[PDB]
Amino acid sequence: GGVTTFVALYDYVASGETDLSFKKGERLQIVNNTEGDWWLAHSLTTGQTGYIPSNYVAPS
Amino acid sequence: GGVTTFVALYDYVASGETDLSFKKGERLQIVNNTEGDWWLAHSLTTGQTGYIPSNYVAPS
């Protein structure tokens, strides 16, 4: 059965606003683009990232 | 060429820690699983989400 969790091998310090910092030994999930009808999105105004309902958006 | 940016149609208030809040009219990117060797991850310890170098992790 597929793995549920990954562990960090090293410390990582983020340089941008889309990447994630973490400490060696930290426990992390690798996540999917989509969760049902929810898509992963990155807010250009608040710089944060997360899933959103795909029916709440339209192309520019 | 493909769309670069989406616009919010309504306000959304997040309920969990994997979902993203945004206001109507916010400009958002829908993001890809991977960017090169980098995968999207969700930190169970800090609750934050972001890209990480895939060579910095191992399965549990």
Numbering used by the authors:
A (entry chain A), B (entry chain B): 81 to 140
Which sentences from the paper describe this structure?
The Src homology 3 (SH3) domain is a ∼60-residue modular domain that consists of two antiparallel β-sheets orthogonally packed to form a single hydrophobic core. This domain is present in many proteins and regulates critical cellular pathways by recognizing polyproline-rich motifs (PRMs; Kurochkina & Guha, 2013). In previous work, the 3D-DS of the c-Src SH3 domain has been characterized and its dependence on experimental conditions has been described. This work explores the role of the hinge-loop composition by interchanging residues in the RT and n-Src loops between two SH3 domains: one being the c-Src SH3 domain, where 3D-DS has been described, and the other being the Abl SH3 domain, where 3D-DS has not been described to date.
Nevertheless, replacing the residues of the RT and n-Src loops of c-Src with those present in Abl results in the formation of intertwined dimers. Crystallographic structures of the intertwined dimers of the Src_Abl-2 and Src_Abl-RT chimeras were obtained. Interestingly, both domain-swapped structures differ from those previously obtained for the WT c-Src SH3 domain. Indeed, the open interface of the Src_Abl-RT and Src_Abl-2 chimeras differs from that present in WT c-Src SH3. As in the WT protein, in the Src_Abl-RT intertwined dimer the n-Src loop is the only hinge loop, although the open protomer shows a different conformation. In the WT protein, a salt bridge between Arg95 and Glu115 stabilizes the dimer. The analysis of the open interface of the Src_Abl-RT dimer shows hydrogen bonds that differ from those found in the dimers of the Src_Abl-2 and WT protein. In this dimer, the n-Src loop adopts an extended β-strand-like conformation that facilitates the interaction between residues of different chains in the open interface: the Asn113A side chain interacts with the backbone atoms of Val111B and Asn112B and the side chain of Asn113B (and vice versa). Additionally, while maintaining the hydrogen bond between Glu106 and Ser123, the distal loop exhibits diverse conformations in the c-Src SH3 domain. As shown in Fig. 8(a), the two chimeras that form an intertwined dimer exhibit the highest B factor in the distal loop. However, although the intertwined dimers of the Src_Abl-RT and Src_Abl-2 chimeras have been obtained in the presence of low-molecular-mass PEGs, this molecule is not part of the dimer interface.
